[PDB]
Structures are given as structure tokens and as C-alpha cells.
Design an enzyme around this catalytic site. Structure first.
Site, PDB file in Angstrom:
ATOM      1  N   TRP D  39       0.817  -1.175   0.000  1.00 40.68           N
ATOM      2  CA  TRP D  39       0.000   0.000   0.000  1.00 40.68           C
ATOM      3  C   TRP D  39       0.862   1.240   0.000  1.00 40.68           C
ATOM      4  O   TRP D  39       2.028   1.178   0.354  1.00 40.68           O
ATOM      5  CB  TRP D  39      -0.989   0.009   1.132  1.00 40.68           C
ATOM      6  CG  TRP D  39      -0.683  -0.113   2.637  1.00 40.68           C
ATOM      7  CD1 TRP D  39      -0.516   0.934   3.505  1.00 40.68           C
ATOM      8  CD2 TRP D  39      -0.523  -1.328   3.442  1.00 40.68           C
ATOM      9  NE1 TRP D  39      -0.267   0.471   4.767  1.00 40.68           N
ATOM     10  CE2 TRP D  39      -0.263  -0.899   4.769  1.00 40.68           C
ATOM     11  CE3 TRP D  39      -0.577  -2.723   3.144  1.00 40.68           C
ATOM     12  CZ2 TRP D  39      -0.052  -1.776   5.831  1.00 40.68           C
ATOM     13  CZ3 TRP D  39      -0.349  -3.576   4.292  1.00 40.68           C
ATOM     14  CH2 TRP D  39      -0.100  -3.093   5.569  1.00 40.68           C
ATOM     15  N   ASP D  58       5.981  -4.574   3.000  1.00 33.86           N
ATOM     16  CA  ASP D  58       6.176  -5.411   4.163  1.00 33.86           C
ATOM     17  C   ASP D  58       7.478  -6.209   3.984  1.00 33.86           C
ATOM     18  O   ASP D  58       8.005  -6.335   2.859  1.00 33.86           O
ATOM     19  CB  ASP D  58       5.015  -6.386   4.299  1.00 33.86           C
ATOM     20  CG  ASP D  58       3.742  -5.735   4.789  1.00 33.86           C
ATOM     21  OD1 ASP D  58       3.824  -4.631   5.383  1.00 33.86           O
ATOM     22  OD2 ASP D  58       2.667  -6.335   4.581  1.00 33.86           O
TER      23      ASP D  58
HETATM   24  N1  LIG Z   1       0.088  -4.149   6.543  1.00 36.28           N
HETATM   25  C1  LIG Z   1       0.962  -4.549   7.425  1.00 36.28           C
HETATM   26  O1  LIG Z   1       2.099  -4.225   7.175  1.00 36.28           O
HETATM   27  C2  LIG Z   1       0.567  -5.348   8.662  1.00 36.28           C
HETATM   28  C3  LIG Z   1      -0.817  -5.927   8.784  1.00 36.28           C
HETATM   29  C4  LIG Z   1      -1.859  -5.157   9.286  1.00 36.28           C
HETATM   30  N2  LIG Z   1      -2.996  -5.885   9.300  1.00 36.28           N
HETATM   31  C5  LIG Z   1      -2.718  -7.121   8.814  1.00 36.28           C
HETATM   32  C6  LIG Z   1      -3.534  -8.237   8.621  1.00 36.28           C
HETATM   33  C7  LIG Z   1      -2.989  -9.404   8.098  1.00 36.28           C
HETATM   34  C8  LIG Z   1      -1.627  -9.448   7.770  1.00 36.28           C
HETATM   35  C9  LIG Z   1      -0.808  -8.334   7.962  1.00 36.28           C
HETATM   36  C10 LIG Z   1      -1.365  -7.174   8.486  1.00 36.28           C
END
Ligand SMILES: *NC(=O)Cc1c[nH]c2ccccc12
Ligand SMILES: *NC(=O)Cc1c[nH]c2ccccc12
Lengths: 361, 119, 360, 110
Positions: D39, D58
Site C-alpha cells: 500500500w 512489508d
Molecule cells: N500491513 C501490514 O504491514 C501489517 C498488517 C496489518 N494488518 C494485517 C492483517 C494481516 C496481515 C498483515 C497485516
């Protein structure tokens, strides 16, 4: 003198049960469903759901469906995305249904893992990151095929007035309706006019769902409607949740599964907070507001208890709210909800609670 | 004293309940089961650590088998770590720092209890 | 402009690193090793270890070894017990070594997952519940021997003065010594006379390990030893950790990895608490006692900080203690330990911390 | 400063900051794998007063870091504007989708 035995069923009857979906985000590979008795706060059992599980109960109340992701060696090895069918009363595994390796991994919004009104098909969100909707034929234990028509849309809103129809919210700010055949393939589809401005008044995906219509609240406290009583969806809105005083204090909605509708009265429940601005759309509830969707007036406001998600039971006239860890049980048979109890420590990190279905035909 | 199902649940769910005197793990009675029944969907272990605990209610000593329920992830509730007469792994069946689910079809540890064998 | 990249090595030198084995008992299928810099408390990385992982670092400091259990669907499906070899600097998986499905599932005492002094063989405890010791050839990536001679015994104490020898504590209260050949198969073995009374004076399994002997403390505060300067182990004891005053307040040892030896001085470190009685052998430390093992007398005592487990670094004269969540770093260059820092929240549920090897 | 959820670049992080996990804002901790997708946010720089595009990649293939959890939502939108949305796992297309931590990669001026 004694012998430890297994094979036992859940101790409390189905109509006492709720399911708290604990993501255990700190250890997300060991997410689970906690089964509680809402009438006394008793912990009844649990269903393990591996990495970022999602859950729903079959419409007929007999089975629990989970959706999850495994890997051969957890952090390495081949991926297996599945739906699992579990027996509701014995909390035991029955069947795995293989999905393509793109089931949505994310927080537990209701609309990501749903089923058709007739219960024959499970309807789930895929993201590869390209989006499509997945259809699973429960009886056959098969994945049918991707609903590619849904690309650029998100989440599943079943139509409770039709046996195998549902909607999704699309990037054009309209709704795409899909009508399945008896084989779970797309038989027909239609697209509504634009309901909301994606740029200027984005809506929360969580519907306040009636039998033939669904309402949605916006980041700025407006309400939009999709009426599916006729052959094609009719959209409308906005109307404002907010009076002048409310507007002056910058009250807006905030939460995850943040709305609910009590169908018989038309009351809509919404988590709200003051001092709203860009970035506050997921803030805990300062208050729960109860709106009459017919008069478009607020009829009650009560303390929010830092709630983030809710669910409504139409057969017992109840609302559950959930702050991430604790579940509040409310009587909503009158305009002002009444707090009956709080179940502390139901989960470490849950944004979704659901009742075990009773009736609902 | 000998029939937890007839007792106040707060009493049986406490690590100080007399029969839980060598429990290392989550009490199954807090996990949707009872002292002698695994929570739904979890499987009793065929092996266990064992030991004796004193019952101050009737003044007698009883043999206990600390069976586990297995094949579900950690219950997380009512964790106890009591150690009366517990001994290291060279007296293996008296030892509670090992997973007594270890020989089950699925060895994931869910909860532990205290089964009353006899005097 | 910026680009996210991978493939990086741990940012601090090996000699600064410690390994906190977090069982995460509340979610034991997501156990893991947390890697910290003891000099400043910085989190450097981690290694996932699935269900109830165990961990050690290779003696040469190059690799991390884990031992764990997988199932095809975690809570159902076929079991796979494995040893995994990981690169110590990249914190990346390299190799899986298949084990028979009986590796010990239990709390992280050092002695359940060890290696020979020469580092060529991994030596691990099995329980089916019948006990045996498994031998893994690191170079070959194979399980090569299963020491049924060790039935009824428990835990592995390596002999630092031989390349491929170790001992185990048996149900008779003596020690079985196993000497492995260069192929990892048992080359010879011997059994000591009884060291301690299993019924009357049980010892904690954790050794205070010297290059050529090991000391053990008991539930009642006595000390036993096993001298392996020769081919046959000579055993002795008890002497008591306690003087008369000590006995008046019922001081006894308690914890898990509860003792340590500073080899240069012969100081032995032991977690102790007052009001000892049946059932208190795993209680947190009220104090750490420092014992002179030559004179068989205490030389110092300090606050225990509720610690349960420790480990010693010989060459930098350091002791780490761990209370389940926090790691205390002590300078032990002089008889009285000096507290240097506490690393808070190093783990949720850890009973084992270990230093990166530097001794080659 | 960079390990604080209020750091200006972190304005749409929902996750654990990689800089607290043995990595940095723009490097994955050892043994975790960058996501090729992410994102994006637009975040305001309080120093030069300009707005910058941030890519929230991520790091993946290791279990949850558990440190420096943030949940900031500036300009974040639901999954119907998918690349602005942060309640999904941006590791979802990696060889191993297990989520470890979240980075805040500066792309440039909006
Ligand atoms: N988007 C991220 O970096 C972390 C994140 C925040 N909510 C979730 C749900 C499932 C997996 C990763 C997540
Ligand atoms: N009594 C039990 O079986 C519970 C328990 C206590 N220690 C451990 C370690 C690993 C798995 C299960 C355990």
C-alpha cells in the site's frame, strides 16, 4: 476412580453461543475462534485457525466454516489456502476444501467471508493482489471459479431476499450484483449507478443489512442506501447522521464492523467519536448512536466502551460489541440499548464477534 | 472433596485446588471441559505424569494422573505451575516439564487436568 | 528515492549477540528465538521455531541449530520432527535434517539439545515416552545413531575436554558416558557409581560445567560432582551450599537453567530462595549465591531479581539471568556480580538464554 | 524518533515497524523478504512542509516481529481503493506470506 474421556459436545445449547474470532496478531499463525456462552460469559471451546483465520457459522447452524492459509513448513514450503468445515456441536474438523492461493489475508471484516442466503455456496474475497470473488460449493466440497467480473471491487454483501445473490462495492462507487446458478457459476450480473463519491465521501464497507436493502455510513457521517427489492439495485444518499451540534463537535463514525441494523424496527447502530478528522476512521467508539432509518433521526446515544466492532441478533434482539478483547452484551428490544454484562478477556486481538444462528428462515 | 463436578467451579478452577498439586499447564476445566472430560475436539493423552496429592478435606492422600487433552492449540486459561513431589526427567513419570501429549496422534498441547485414580 | 532491500546480515558483531529462546507458551506453535545485542539491548533479529522449538548456536559460531515439530495442518496431519540449520549472520534457513518422531517436547533446559565439543555432532534428547539420545551428523545432514543405552536417563552434558563425548543422568543416580566415533556411532561407553540418591536428594539436571568436571546442585541445597579428567568419571558429594544460619531460614536452590560456572575462578552461581519446602524447586530467585567450589564456601550473595535461568560467558566474564521476560546482564570479572543493564520484554515466556560462541 | 508511530513517514502504517525488528526503514530484518507490492500513503513532512509518497512494503516469511506496533490511518481508504488500504497483508503475493514487519519507503514528492 476416574477416566479422562473425549468426544464430548459443547456444554451450552447453540442458542447461548457466540464466536469471537481472535486474530492473535502478535502470533498471527496461531489465530483461533473462541466459543463463549453470552448469557454467562463461560468459555465453551475453540477452533484453531492457523494463519489469520476467518470464520462464519453455516446458516443452518450445524457447521462452523473457517478459512485459513497453511504452508508445509509455516514460514516456507508450499502454500495451501483452505476452507474447513467443522462440526458446530463437537468442534471437530470434518472436511478441507482447497482454494487457489489467493484468499484474502486481512482483518476480519464480515464481508470477506460470507455465504449465500440458501447456504449452498460460500462466497469469499480473493486478492492476488488483483481482486476477484471465490465461490465454494459446500455440498460438493469444491471451488467453482473466480468471479472475475468483481475485479476492482471489495467485500461480499449477500441479498437476504434471494437464495444465491450478493453484491460487492466497486472502485467506481457503485455496486456490482452477482446472481449465481445452481452450479455456483455466475448466471447474471448487474451494476448500479454511482452510490457514493470514492474521493469525496468514502463509505465504510460494513453494511447495515436489511432483508431487501443495505445502508452504509461514510467517513464524514453520511448514510447511503442500496435497495435490492426490485430487479435492479436502486441507490440513494447521502443523508447526514449529524445535527448541527454534532457537526460542531466533528462527530464521525469509526470502527471496523462498525454498524448494525435491527430489521424489525429499522434502527441502525453506529460507533461514533468526536473531533473527527483525516485519519480517525478506525478510532474506538466514544458512543454508540442509534438511528431510526425511516425518520432519519437519532433516537439514542450511549457510552461506546471503546468498542470497534459489533454484531446484531434479530431473533433475540441483542447487540454485541467488542473492543479488541472484551465483549459487551446489550438488550436492544427498545430504542435505548441496555448493557447486560461484559465478558472480559474473550480474545487478545479480535475485531469480529458473531452469534450462533437461531432460526432465520 | 473427591467430586469436582459437584463443587463450586471457582474452587476447582484454582491452582490451589488440592488435586492439582503437580499441574504444569492450563486447567481443562477452564477450557470448556471438566476435570475429567476434554474440551470438545481435543483428545486425551494415553500417558501422563503421575503423583500423589493430600486432600485436606478428608485427611487422605490420593494418586493422581495428570493427563493432557491434545490436538488443539493452547487453551491459555487457568495456567498453573505447581510442583509438589515433582522430580526431574530421570524420574520421568513424576516430571511435568515435558509435553504429556508427546505420543498422541497430534501432539499439540491444549490443556492438562488431574484425574483421581485412588487412595 | 528509496528501495526496500533484503539479504542483509545482523547489524552487530557475533560477539555482542545473545539468543533468547521464547517458547511463547500461550501460543506455543509460534515459538521463536529472539536475537539481542547484550551491550545495548537492541533487537537484532529472530528465527521462527514452530511448536516448542529448541535452539543452540554452533560451537564455531557460524550456524544456528533449531529443533522443532511440524504437522501438515499443525493440529492434524503427519508429524515431522526436524533439526534445522540456519546461517548465523543472515538468519536464513539452510537445511532440514529429518528426525524420528520422538524429539523431546518440553521446557528449554540446555541439556535437551546440545553438541559435541568439536561441533561435528548434534546430540539431542528423545522421549516416546521411552528415552534415548539421538545423534545428528551436521556435515552429512543425517540422523546417524540412537543411543538406547541411555534408556531411563535424561539430558546431555558434553565433556569440554574431549571432542565427541557427553554424559547423561540415569535413574540409578549415576552418569552414563558416551564417546562417539568420528562417524557419530557410539565408540564406547561407561557407567559411574551412584553419585546421588534419586529418592533422598534429587539433583537439578542443570550442570555447572568446567572443562573437566561438572557440579550439580540438589533440591535440598547440596552439591555433587562428576570429574571426567580421566576415561572413567569419578563422582562425589554431597557438600552443602548452606551454613547454619542459611539452614535456619530454609534456603534452597530453585529455577530451571539455575546454575553456572566461571571456569577461570571456579566460582559457581546458583539461584536460591528462602522458606524452601516440597514444591519450591522452580521458584524464582530471591538471591544469586556465589560459591567458591575449591573451598566449598559461599563468597557473595546478591539480589536475584526473580530470575529463573542463567548462562555464563567465560571470556568476557559475563552472566545473563532471565526471569521469563527480561534479561539481566552482569559483569562477573570479580566475585560480586555487577548489574550492567536489564533488557525488558526480551521474551514473553523464555526459560533459556545463550551467548553467541566466541571460543572457536 | 524513527521507531515511534508518530514519525512523519509512518502516517499509514498498520503493523510492526521494521526499524524496531532488526531492520531499518528501508531494509528488511535479516532473513525476511521484501514484498514486491504494497500500500502507499501520502504523508506530510513537518520540516519542509511538503507531502511525500510513501510505499508501505512489508517484510515477509518470518513470524510476527511484535515490536513497535502502529495503526496510523492518514489518507487510508477501504479495499475498493485497494492500494491505499492497510487492513490487508501486503505480503499476500510473496513466496511465503507470513507477515513479519512493515517498512516506510520514501518514493518522492507527491
Ligand atoms: N500491513 C501490514 O504491514 C501489517 C498488517 C496489518 N494488518 C494485517 C492483517 C494481516 C496481515 C498483515 C497485516
Ligand atoms: N503438562 C503438560 O503436558 C503441559 C506442558 C508443560 N510443559 C510443556 C512443554 C511443552 C509442551 C507442553 C507442556
Amino acid at each position: 476412580r476416574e477416566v479422562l474421556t473425549g468426544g464430548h459436545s459443547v456444554s451450552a445449547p447453540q442458542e447461548n453461543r457466540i464466536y469471537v474470532m481472535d486474530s492473535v496478531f502478535m502470533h498471527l499463525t496461531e489465530s483461533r475462534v473462541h466459543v463463549y456462552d453470552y448469557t454467562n460469559g463461560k468459555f465453551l471451546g475453540m477452533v484453531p485457525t492457523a494463519f489469520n483465520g476467518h470464520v462464519q457459522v453455516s446458516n443452518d447452524g450445524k457447521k462452523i466454516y473457517t478459512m485459513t492459509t497453511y504452508h508445509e513448513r509455516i514460514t516456507r514450503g508450499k502454500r495451501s489456502d483452505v476452507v474447513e468445515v467443522w462440526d458446530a456441536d463437537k468442534l471437530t474438523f470434518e472436511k478441507e476444501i482447497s482454494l487457489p492461493p489467493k484468499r484474502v489475508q486481512g482483518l476480519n471484516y464480515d464481508g470477506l467471508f460470507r455465504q449465500t442466503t440458501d447456504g449452498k455456496f460460500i462466497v469469499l474475497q480473493n486478492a492476488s493482489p488483483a481482486t476477484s470473488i471465490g465461490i465454494v460449493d459446500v455440498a460438493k466440497g469444491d471451488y467453482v471459479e473466480d468471479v472475475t467480473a468483481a475485479a476492482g471491487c471489495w467485500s461480499v454483501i449477500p441479498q437476504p431476499n434471494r437464495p444465491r445473490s450478493f453484491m460487492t462495492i466497486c472502485g467506481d462507487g457503485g455496486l456490482l450484483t452477482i446472481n449465481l446458478g445452481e452450479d455456483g457459476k455466475v448466471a447474471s450480473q448487474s451494476r448500479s449507478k454511482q452510490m457514493f463519491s470514492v474521493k469525496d465521501d468514502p463509505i465504510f464497507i460494513a453494511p447495515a443489512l436489511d432483508k431487501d436493502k443495505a445502508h452504509f455510513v461514510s467517513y464524514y457521517g453520511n448514510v447511503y442506501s442500496a435497495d435490492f427489492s426490485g430487479d435492479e439495485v436502486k441507490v440513494d444518499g447521502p443523508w447526514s447522521l449529524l445535527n448541527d451540534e454534532d457537526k460542531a463537535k466533528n462527530w464521525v463514525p469509526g470502527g471496523y464492523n462498525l454498524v448494525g441494523l435491527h430489521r424489525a424496527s429499522g434502527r441502525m447502530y453506529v460507533f461514533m467519536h468526536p473531533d473527527g478528522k483525516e485519519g480517525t476512521h478506525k478510532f474506538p467508539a466514544a458512543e454508540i448512536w442509534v438511528m431510526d432509518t425511516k425518520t432519519k433521526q437519532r433516537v439514542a446515544r450511549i457510552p461506546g466502551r471503546d468498542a470497534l466492532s459489533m454484531t446484531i441478533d434479530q431473533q433475540r434482539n441483542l447487540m454485541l460489541t467488542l473492543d479488541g478483547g472484551n465483549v459487551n452484551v446489550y438488550d436492544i428490544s427498545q430504542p435505548e440499548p441496555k448493557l447486560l454484562r461484559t465478558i472480559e478477556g474473550a480474545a487478545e486481538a479480535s475485531l469480529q464477534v458473531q452469534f450462533h444462528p437461531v432460526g432465520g428462515t | 472433596s473427591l467430586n469436582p463436578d459437584l463443587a463450586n467451579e471457582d474452587e476447582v478452577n484454582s491452582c490451589d485446588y488440592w488435586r492439582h498439586c503437580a499441574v504444569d499447564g492450563f486447567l481443562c476445566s477452564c477450557c470448556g471441559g471438566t476435570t475429567t472430560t476434554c474440551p470438545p475436539g481435543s483428545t486425551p493423552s494415553p500417558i501422563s505424569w503421575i503423583g500423589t496429592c493430600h486432600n485436606p478435606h478428608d485427611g487422605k492422600d490420593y494418586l493422581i494422573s495428570y493427563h493432557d487433552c491434545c490436538g488443539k492449540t493452547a487453551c491459555g486459561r487457568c495456567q498453573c505451575n505447581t510442583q509438589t513431589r515433582e522430580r526431574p526427567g530421570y524420574e520421568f513419570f513424576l516430571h511435568n516439564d515435558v509435553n504429556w501429549c508427546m505420543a498422541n496422534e497430534n501432539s499439540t498441547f491444549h490443556c492438562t487436568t488431574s484425574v483421581l485414580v485412588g487412595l
